[PDB]
């Protein structure tokens, strides 16, 4: 039914990155936005290959911008959009650029930055080289802002995620508690034997002393 | 940033693998290990999850004589550190 | 507007409910009922009660009911309530409990059924003696639009995250306790071994 | 009803008390403990939260010679067990 299969999708990048967001309000601000890069396949056909990117905020849980691209429609964005790459290595290079955006100080000669421009119904994300008055788009991508339906589905996916992580943590907590109980019991055993040996040593010392 | 220090392969089987990593001092809620044929799209590597306390894992169902990609990712809250990966052939 | 920050949860458990809809056929599914008593952020003296029907299987299933004390007086005349606004949750939980502990051998056969007809949903708990059916409580729930379901998912994710951080702290605490026990064990075995070598060296005399 | 069926007041000082419950058979991630004077009509009871690992809790700052209703609720991830309530004067 649903196009993309998130259940068996692979997460390659999930980290906050500094992003400049521009809107018609003109309230230009730098916010740290969480980028999740996913490679997966469609549930309709195992041959259809999809890459999807999610831009979210841990501060605003209702902020979501999505990108979904197949292998076929990849030709439209391979030309006319950014550096030459195949569908396979496009994630790798985009990840490298995002990482460069994270470790980006003014004194960096290739000061790479990331900008998300949101205009009404559409948003365009571009990573740009910005030194000596140059603005050079290394990557330019188009993102769909979240409707209530897709943000709802995203929230549900993250909720199930957190539930699974926390159940795993509960299993680990029970195991560590068992390990600590075993360790304290072994500690009691050792101390009891040490007290016994000190007793025998003191008795031996008093016997020799006489 | 390569959250697991270093990775090694220890198993020697035709259908499976056993991988070992080392325990980073950062907070890790879980590790995800991906195994897929080299050169593949990577959106069909069948991920599986390992607790953050553990440093070892077993893979199964592999075809012998194929180049498989083994990647370890460690996850924090609201984040995932950069992975470290090795490839091996059966 | 209700303030969940200072609310108290009185019942939060899956309940056996038979849900019948016009689009899909009759099924019995286990649904999660959350009953909350709290007060408004506009007035801390004003009392509101909220009930949520969700599914652990379907995270997009949400039906909500929230009542003030005044319109609860209106519903006291609308359904013959004979108890106060305070103890009404108790009766509701008891009714739900009767559905929870309900088997075919039960003579009262207390049941829960929820029918959704395109914007309107009524939840009813019923006594079923022979064929006669007496609904002890009948309530009207507005199904969730995507906006309120979205807000519900966000709040519930914040809850799971907070409880999970508390568990993470406890896990770190137990791990530290285990490390302390390992260190004390090492100290104990060390002094045992060295006092044994002292035992034998004093045997050397 | 009460999932632990075992709540009592165990230590007692004029300004403080110690409560002990028993709910280890089920998985319990946390407990919420509510302590307030009046029975019902509760718009000022002080709640505090306790990890599921604990089997004890201390309340302090209580008014001497007063009647307190104390309730313990145990929570799971997707559920809340039935609570247990006691009345004590200190």
Author numbering:
A (entry chain A): 13 to 222
B (entry chain D0A0), D (entry chain D): 2 to 91
C (entry chain B000): 15 to 219
Passage from the reporting paper:
SAS-6 proteins contain an N-terminal globular head domain followed by a long coiled-coil, and a C-terminal region predicted to be unstructured. Moreover, SAS-6 homodimers can form higher order oligomers through a weaker interaction between two head domains from neighboring homodimers, with a ~40° angle between the two coiled-coil pairs. Here, we developed monobodies against Chlamydomonas reinhardtii SAS-6, characterizing three in detail with X-ray crystallography, atomic force microscopy and cryo-electron microscopy.
We found that MBCRS6-1 recognized CrSAS-6_6HR but not CrSAS-6_N, indicating that residues in the coiled-coil are essential for binding in this case. MBCRS6-1 was crystallized with CrSAS-6_6HR harboring the mutation F145E to prevent the interaction between N-terminal domains that would result in a poly-disperse specimen hindering crystallization. To determine the impact of MBCRS6-1 binding on CrSAS-6_6HR, we compared the structure of the complex with that of CrSAS-6_6HR alone, which uncovered a conformational tilt of ~7°. Furthermore, measurements of ring diameter revealed a slight shift of symmetries, now including some tenfold symmetrical assemblies. Together, these findings are compatible with the suggestion from the co-crystal structure that MBCRS6-1 binding might result in the formation of larger ring polymers. MBCRS6-1 binding to SAS-6 does not impact its ability to form rings or stacks. We propose that the resulting ring polymer adopts a slightly increased diameter on average to compensate for the strain imparted by the increased pitch; this has no detectable detrimental consequence in the cellular context. Moreover, MBCRS6-1 might stabilize the SAS-6 ring polymer, since the head-to-head interface is present in the co-crystal structure despite the F145E mutation, in line with the higher number of centrioles observed in cells upon MBCRS6-1 expression.
